[PDB]
Amino acid sequence: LDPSLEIYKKMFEVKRREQLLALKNLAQLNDIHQQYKILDVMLKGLFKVLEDSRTVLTAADVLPDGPFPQDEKLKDAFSHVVENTAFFGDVVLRFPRIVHYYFDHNSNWNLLIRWGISFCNQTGVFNQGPHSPILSLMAQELGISEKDSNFQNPFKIDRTEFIPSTDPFQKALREEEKRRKKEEKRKEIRKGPRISR
Amino acid sequence: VDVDGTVEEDLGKSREGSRTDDEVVQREEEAIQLDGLNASQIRELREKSEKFAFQAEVNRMMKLIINSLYKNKEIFLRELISNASDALDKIRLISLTDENALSGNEELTVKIKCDKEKNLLHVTDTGVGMTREELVKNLGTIAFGVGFYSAFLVADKVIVTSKHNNDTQHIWESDSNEFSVIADPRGNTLGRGTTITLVLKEEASDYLELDTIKNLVKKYSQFINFPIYVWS
Amino acid sequence: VRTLQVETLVEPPEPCAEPAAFGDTLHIHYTGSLVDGRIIDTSLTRDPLVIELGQKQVIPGLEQSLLDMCVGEKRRAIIPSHLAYGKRGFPPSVPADAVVQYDVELIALIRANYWLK
């Protein structure tokens, strides 16, 4: 596309490095209770910013499949829409349940992101590089696009799993533990000559 | 989730008779203690430490998302110097296998000269360097490469003089519209490494300032292993 | 389908005291689909979509179809390609030059009474 837009592809991927670096940083946190609190701020700040960004592009009336966003007012909005949405895909994939609770409920948020996703899909930004699959994966995750037969969110595991009714490994753990308890008892008796009943 | 039903508050429990006090902890946790530290006070203190730090995480994310990075691209110096350190690192690794790698310039340093009058910034490094073919391929066609190419955010035109061990010194110049590579008139002045002369934009005059460049070096490139020199 | 087609599915329960007009804030539920029946998006399981008429927050045909809508009314709008997503479409969900259908119910209308403000 436009040569400056080609430069933007490097710019967008560059932001991705920081976005993924932070994404790992959030993973380092352990408490879910803090995690949702900040994540909720992620959605409210990002989506509200996205709402302004779409309005900025709407006033600009610049085709997504077109020349590089040049005017700084629209161009920053283009950075926000593509970059924030790409991070939104990482957040959705890494944290599917959290986002869905705080995002699916609001029709405005889904419609606004849907405009962004098509807006990215027409620009061609997610066509080259290692972040091009992100647009396909996030749409599938959100149900905007059909889920592939082999498409599974690695993070979307059922941590609740199922009650460990089958615990033969834990039964062995119990045995060995009690067995060590039994071994010490015998060792105690050893010592030297005790009294006789 | 497992069950539903959240109790309400008994606004007037106190009247109940022959019942045990269900609030000892709460009351006792705030009693003034002479020659001792009040239980409530210690709790508050740690809370401030932990809670304050947590707020900082929101702060960091807020900036990253709410920013415009390229609009406020003061990081361009970080990108430029970071490449210079990387190239010096690469040549150092090559030097161990091959003695000739460091033959052009054994000394590994970065020299920065600021030319405010000409709107030019000169960054000289003694790193791996680049051949004529590499200048056309790597630089003539872009691509991360952001480290060098961040300069264009504040610069209209970039001039690169690069000498690599395998080739003679060549100069690649581009204004982002077209690029030309020609043999360096001065020859192997660097011996090996790259010197970038940056044709800054009008808005970038502040970067030309000697104090500003030094502040950027401290802000982003303070941790570079190789010594950094600023013209003075 | 070259022109916007609007059909009233459900009439308003009470005589329309305040018909929707430009500038009003509308809460609406909608189901958008392609002409072949594939659902593009639906708000029926979510909170109502909040839009201001005239702000170009939805496709032109949908905004036009909401004019003069009454609270409690349901309409079906068949929107030609040039008033919906045009030649570019809405990938990955809407092909190029697609005609779309929206079933919409007006749930609430907030034009603020100047006296009430």
Add this chain to the structure above:
Amino acid sequence: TDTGKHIKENDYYTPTGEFRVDREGSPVLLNCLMYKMCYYRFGQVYTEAK
């Protein structure tokens, strides 16, 4: 009472003088009869979604 002399209130507190049932709670408190009865099998229950 005389028979209960072994029971000391401070033993059930954290070193900082706190009554807590979390990981930082006093070892005696976590292993007392009452704590086990109230919290038997309660660890795996989700009280709240959040």
